[PDB]
Amino acid sequence: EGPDNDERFTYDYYRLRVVGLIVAAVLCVIGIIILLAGKC
Amino acid sequence: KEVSMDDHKLSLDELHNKYGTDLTRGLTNARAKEILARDGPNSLTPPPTTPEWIKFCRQLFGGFSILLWIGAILCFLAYGIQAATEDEPANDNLYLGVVLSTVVIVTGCFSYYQEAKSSRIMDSFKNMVPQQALVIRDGEKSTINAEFVVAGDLVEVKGGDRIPADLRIISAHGCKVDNSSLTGESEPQTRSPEFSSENPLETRNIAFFSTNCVEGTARGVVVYTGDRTVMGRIATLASGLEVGRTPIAIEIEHFIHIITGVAVFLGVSFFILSLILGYSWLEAVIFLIGIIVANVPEGLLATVTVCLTLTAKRMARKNCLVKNLEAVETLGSTSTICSDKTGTLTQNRMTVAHMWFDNQIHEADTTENQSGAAFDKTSATWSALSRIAALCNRAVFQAGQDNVPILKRSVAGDASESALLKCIELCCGSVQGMRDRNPKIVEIPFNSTNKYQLSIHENEKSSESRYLLVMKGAPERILDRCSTILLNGAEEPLKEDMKEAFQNAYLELGGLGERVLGFCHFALPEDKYNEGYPFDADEPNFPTTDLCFVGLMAMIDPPRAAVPDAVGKCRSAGIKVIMVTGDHPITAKAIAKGVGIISEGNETIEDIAARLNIPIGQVNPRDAKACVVHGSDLKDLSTEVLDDILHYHTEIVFARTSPQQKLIIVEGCQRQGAIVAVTGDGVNDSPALKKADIGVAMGISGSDVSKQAADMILLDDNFASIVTGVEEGRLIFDNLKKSIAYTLTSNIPEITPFLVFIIGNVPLPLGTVTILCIDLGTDMVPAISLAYEQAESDIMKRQPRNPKTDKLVNERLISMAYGQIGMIQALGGFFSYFVILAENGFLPMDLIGKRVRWDDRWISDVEDSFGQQWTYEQRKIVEFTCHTSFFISIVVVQWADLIICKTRRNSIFQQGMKNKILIFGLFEETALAAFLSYCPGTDVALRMYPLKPSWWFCAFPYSLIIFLYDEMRRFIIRRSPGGWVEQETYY
Amino acid sequence: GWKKFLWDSEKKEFLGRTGSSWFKIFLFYLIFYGCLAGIFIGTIQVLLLTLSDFEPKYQDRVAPPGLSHAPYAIKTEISFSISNPKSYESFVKSMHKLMDLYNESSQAGNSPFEDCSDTPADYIKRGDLDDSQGQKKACRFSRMWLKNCSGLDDTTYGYAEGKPCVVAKLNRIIGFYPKPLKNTTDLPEELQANYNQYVLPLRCAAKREEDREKIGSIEYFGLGGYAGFPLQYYPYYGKRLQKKYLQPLLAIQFTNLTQNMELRIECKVYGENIDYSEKDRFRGRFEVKIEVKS
Ligand SMILES: *[C@@H]1O[C@H](CO[C@@H]2O[C@@H](C)[C@@H](O)[C@@H](O)[C@@H]2O)[C@@H](O[C@@H]2O[C@H](CO)[C@@H](O[C@@H]3O[C@H](CO[C@H]4O[C@H](CO)[C@@H](O)[C@H](O)[C@@H]4O)[C@@H](O)[C@H](O[C@H]4O[C@H](CO)[C@@H](O)[C@H](O)[C@@H]4O)[C@@H]3O)[C@H](O)[C@H]2NC(C)=O)[C@H](O)[C@H]1NC(C)=O
Ligand SMILES: *[C@@H]1O[C@H](CO[C@@H]2O[C@@H](C)[C@@H](O)[C@@H](O)[C@@H]2O)[C@@H](O[C@@H]2O[C@H](CO)[C@@H](O[C@@H]3O[C@H](CO)[C@@H](O)[C@H](O[C@H]4O[C@H](CO)[C@@H](O)[C@H](O)[C@@H]4O)[C@@H]3O)[C@H](O)[C@H]2NC(C)=O)[C@H](O)[C@H]1NC(C)=O
Ligand SMILES: CCCCCCCC/C=C\CCCCCCCC(=O)OC[C@H](COP(=O)(O)OCC[N+](C)(C)C)OC(=O)CCCCCCC/C=C\CCCCCCCC
Ligand SMILES: CCCCCCCC/C=C\CCCCCCCC(=O)OC[C@H](COP(=O)(O)OCC[N+](C)(C)C)OC(=O)CCCCCCC/C=C\CCCCCCCC
Ligand SMILES: CCCCCCCC/C=C\CCCCCCCC(=O)OC[C@H](COP(=O)(O)OCC[N+](C)(C)C)OC(=O)CCCCCCC/C=C\CCCCCCCC
Ligand SMILES: CCCCCCCC/C=C\CCCCCCCC(=O)OC[C@H](COP(=O)(O)OCC[N+](C)(C)C)OC(=O)CCCCCCC/C=C\CCCCCCCC
Ligand SMILES: CCCCCCCC/C=C\CCCCCCCC(=O)OC[C@H](COP(=O)(O)OCC[N+](C)(C)C)OC(=O)CCCCCCC/C=C\CCCCCCCC
Ligand SMILES: CCCCCCCC/C=C\CCCCCCCC(=O)OC[C@H](COP(=O)(O)OCC[N+](C)(C)C)OC(=O)CCCCCCC/C=C\CCCCCCCC
Ligand SMILES: CCCCCCCC/C=C\CCCCCCCC(=O)OC[C@H](COP(=O)(O)OCC[N+](C)(C)C)OC(=O)CCCCCCC/C=C\CCCCCCCC
Ligand SMILES: *[C@@H]1O[C@H](CO)[C@@H](O[C@@H]2O[C@H](CO)[C@@H](O)[C@H](O)[C@H]2NC(C)=O)[C@H](O)[C@H]1NC(C)=O
Ligand SMILES: CC(C)CCC[C@@H](C)[C@H]1CC[C@H]2[C@@H]3CC=C4C[C@@H](O)CC[C@]4(C)[C@H]3CC[C@]12C
Ligand SMILES: CC(C)CCC[C@@H](C)[C@H]1CC[C@H]2[C@@H]3CC=C4C[C@@H](O)CC[C@]4(C)[C@H]3CC[C@]12C
Ligand SMILES: CC(C)CCC[C@@H](C)[C@H]1CC[C@H]2[C@@H]3CC=C4C[C@@H](O)CC[C@]4(C)[C@H]3CC[C@]12C
Ligand SMILES: [Mg+2]
Ligand SMILES: [Mg+2]
B794 annotated active-site: no
The secondary structure of B432-449 as a DSSP string is HHHHHHS-EEEEE---TT
The residue among C140, C155, C168, C131 whose CA lies nearest residue C246 is C140
Residues B619, C271: Cα–Cα separation, whole Å: 113
CB C80 within 8 A of CB C91: yes
> Cβ contacts (< 8 Å) between C174 and chain B: which residues?
866-868
Task: Give every CB contact of residue B291 below 8 A, 6+ residues apart in sequence.
Answer: B263, B266, B267, B270, B751, B754
Residues B708, B697: Cα–Cα separation, whole Å: 9
Task: Give every CB contact of residue A14 below 8 A, 6+ residues apart in sequence.
Answer: none
Q: Write the DSSP symbol of residue C174.
A: B
Residues B613, B627: Cα–Cα separation, whole Å: 18
**Distances from the Cα of B396 to the Cα of B349, B368, B392, B419, angstroms:** 16, 20, 12, 11
Task: Give every CB contact of residue B444 below 8 A, 6+ residues apart in sequence.
Answer: B450, B453, B454, B455, B537
Calculate the CA C219 to chain-centre distance. Answer: 23
Cα(B797) to centroid(ligand 8), Å: 23
What type of residue is B553?
M
| Residue of A9, A11, A13, A16 best to disrupt the C interface, most CBs of C under 10 A | A9
Question: Which technique was the structure solved with, according to the deposited record?
Answer: cryo-EM
The answer to whether B868 contacts C283, with C-beta atoms less than 8 Å apart, is no
Q: Is B325 left (phi over 0), alpha (psi -120 to 50) or beta?
A: alpha
Residues C222, C119: Cα–Cα separation, whole Å: 10
Degrees, nearest 5: CA angle B978-B983-C2: 135
Degrees, nearest 5: CA angle C143-C149-C155: 95
Cα(B755) to centroid(ligand 15), Å: 17
Helix/strand/coil percentages in chain A, nearest 5: 70, 0, 30
What dihedral angle (degrees, nearest 10) is formed by the CA atoms of A20, A22, A27, A28? 110
| Residue of C41, C45, C98, C171 best to disrupt the B interface, most CBs of B under 10 A | C171
**Distances from the Cα of B527 to the Cα of B461, B466, B467, B729, angstroms:** 17, 10, 11, 71
CB B236 within 8 A of CB B45: yes
The answer to whether A3 contacts C58, with C-beta atoms less than 8 Å apart, is no
How many CA atoms within 13 Å lie on the side-chain side of B222?
Answer: 32
Please give the sequence-ordered ranges of beta strands (E in DSSP) within B582-671, or none if there are none: 626-630, 651-655
Calculate the CA B819 to chain-centre distance. Answer: 38
Residues B458, B465: Cα–Cα separation, whole Å: 9
Inter-axis angle of helices B563-573 and B720-745, nearest 10:
40
Question: Which atom of ligand 3 lies closest to the CA of B928?
Answer: 54
Burial call A1-13: b when 16+ CB within 10 Å, e when fewer:
eeeeeeeebeeee
How far apart are the CA of A20 and the nearest CA of chain C, in angstroms?
Answer: 20
How many CA atoms within 13 Å lie on the side-chain side of C151?
Answer: 18
Q: What is the CATH number of domain B348-558?
A: 3.40.1110.10
The secondary structure of B240-307 as a DSSP string is -PPP---HHHHHHHHHHHHHHHHHHHHHHHHHHHHHHTT--HHHHHHHHHHHHHHH--TTHHHHHHHH
Cα(C110) to centroid(ligand 1), Å: 27
Residues B219, B135: Cα–Cα separation, whole Å: 9
Residues B246, B736: Cα–Cα separation, whole Å: 14
3-state secondary structure of B788: coil
Query: What is the 3-state secondary structure of B548-594?
Result: EEEEEEEEECCECCCHHHHHHHHHHHCCEEEEEECCCHHHHHHHHHH
The residue of chain C nearest to residue B843, with distances taken between CA atoms, is: C48
Assigned fold of B58-111+241-334+720-987: Calcium-transporting ATPase, transmembrane domain (1.20.1110)
Residue C193 contacts B, CB cutoff 8 Å: no
Inter-axis angle of helices C19-50 and B823-840, nearest 10:
20
- What residues form DSSP beta bridges with B869? B863
The residue among B827, B774, B785 whose CA lies nearest residue B914 is B785
Q: Which long-range contacts (CB under 8 A, 24 or more apart) does B135-141 make?
A: B135/B26, B136/B25, B136/B26, B136/B219, B137/B25, B137/B26, B137/B27, B137/B28, B137/B29, B137/B32, B138/B25, B138/B26, B138/B28, B138/B29, B139/B24, B139/B25, B139/B26
Q: Write the DSSP symbol of residue A9.
A: G
CA dihedral over C266, C272, C274, C276, signed as positive or negative: positive
CB B920 within 8 A of CB A34: yes
Burial call B408-427: b when 16+ CB within 10 Å, e when fewer:
ebebeeebbbbbbbbbbbbb
Burial call B945-971: b when 16+ CB within 10 Å, e when fewer:
bbbeeebbebbeebbebbbebbeebbe
Residues B143, B141: Cα–Cα separation, whole Å: 7
Residue A15 contacts C, CB cutoff 8 Å: no
10 Å Cβ neighbour count for B792? 19
Give all strands of the β-sheet with B712-714 in edge-to-edge order. Answer: B320-322, B712-714, B694-698, B676-680, B336-340, B576-581, B651-655, B626-630
Residues B879, B870: Cα–Cα separation, whole Å: 12
Residues B318, B336: Cα–Cα separation, whole Å: 21
> Cβ contacts (< 8 Å) between B947 and chain A: which residues?
20
What dihedral angle (degrees, nearest 10) is formed by the CA atoms of B75, B76, B77, B79? 90
Burial call B189-226: b when 16+ CB within 10 Å, e when fewer:
bebbbeeeeeebeebbbbbbbbbbbbebebbbbbbbbb
Measured between CB atoms, which of C63, C123, C128 is closest to A9?
C63
For this entry, resolution in Å reads: 3.5
- What residues form DSSP beta bridges with B443? B455
Residues C228, C234: Cα–Cα separation, whole Å: 14
Task: Give every CB contact of residue C68 below 8 A, 6+ residues apart in sequence.
Answer: B860, B861, B869, B871, C168, C169, C171, C282, C286
Residues B859, B877: Cα–Cα separation, whole Å: 15
Q: What is the CATH number of domain B1-41+121-240?
A: 2.70.150.10
Residues C289, C268: Cα–Cα separation, whole Å: 15
The residue among C97, C139, C134 whose CA lies nearest residue C117 is C139
10 Å Cβ neighbour count for B543? 13
CB A13 within 8 A of CB A21: no
Residues B744, B754: Cα–Cα separation, whole Å: 17
Assigned fold of B335-347+559-719: Rossmann fold (3.40.50)
What type of residue is C11?
K
Show me where the domains of chain B are located. 1-41+121-240, 58-111+241-334+720-987, 335-347+559-719, 348-558
Task: Give every CB contact of residue A39 below 8 A, 6+ residues apart in sequence.
Answer: none
CB B714 within 8 A of CB B697: yes
How many CA atoms within 13 Å lie on the side-chain side of B268?
Answer: 5
Gyration radius from chain C CA atoms: 28
CB C235 within 8 A of CB C123: yes
The residue among C252, C251, C256 whose CA lies nearest residue C292 is C256
How many CA atoms within 13 Å lie on the side-chain side of B99?
Answer: 23
Given ligand 4 and candidates B884, B940, B942, which is best to mutate, with the most ligand atoms within 8 Å of its CB? B940
Distance in Å from the first CA to the final CA of chain B: 59
Degrees, nearest 5: CA angle B765-B767-B773: 125
Residues B840, B725: Cα–Cα separation, whole Å: 60
CB B918 within 8 A of CB B978: no
- What residues form DSSP beta bridges with B470? B455, B521
CB B682 within 8 A of CB B659: yes
The answer to whether B930 contacts A38, with C-beta atoms less than 8 Å apart, is no
Distance in Å from the first CA to the final CA of chain C: 73
Residues B186, B193: Cα–Cα separation, whole Å: 22
Residues B672, B397: Cα–Cα separation, whole Å: 49
The residue among B811, B457, B958, B212 whose CA lies nearest residue C21 is B811
Length of chain C (residues): 294
Task: Give every CB contact of residue B901 below 8 A, 6+ residues apart in sequence.
Answer: B738, B741, B742, B786
Measured between CB atoms, which of A1, A10, A11 is closest to C175?
A1
The residue of chain A nearest to residue B922, with distances taken between CA atoms, is: A31
Cα(C41) to centroid(ligand 13), Å: 6
How far apart are the CA of A29 and the nearest CA of chain B, in angstroms?
Answer: 9
10 Å Cβ neighbour count for B791? 15
Residues C165, C147: Cα–Cα separation, whole Å: 11
Task: Give every CB contact of residue B211 below 8 A, 6+ residues apart in sequence.
Answer: B162, B163, B177, B178, B179, B181, B182, B231
> Cβ contacts (< 8 Å) between C238 and chain B: which residues?
866-868
- What residues form DSSP beta bridges with B142? B135
Which residues are within 5 Å of ligand 15 (an ion), measured at CB?
A: B 746, 775
The residue among B763, B863, B846 whose CA lies nearest residue C68 is B863
3-state secondary structure of B515: strand
Residues B789, B916: Cα–Cα separation, whole Å: 9
The residue among C258, C235, C233 whose CA lies nearest residue C247 is C233
Q: Write the DSSP symbol of residue B452.
A: B
Distance in Å from the first CA to the final CA of chain A: 62
- What residues form DSSP beta bridges with B606? none
β-bridge pairing C138-139 and B132-137: unpaired
Residues B145, B133: Cα–Cα separation, whole Å: 6
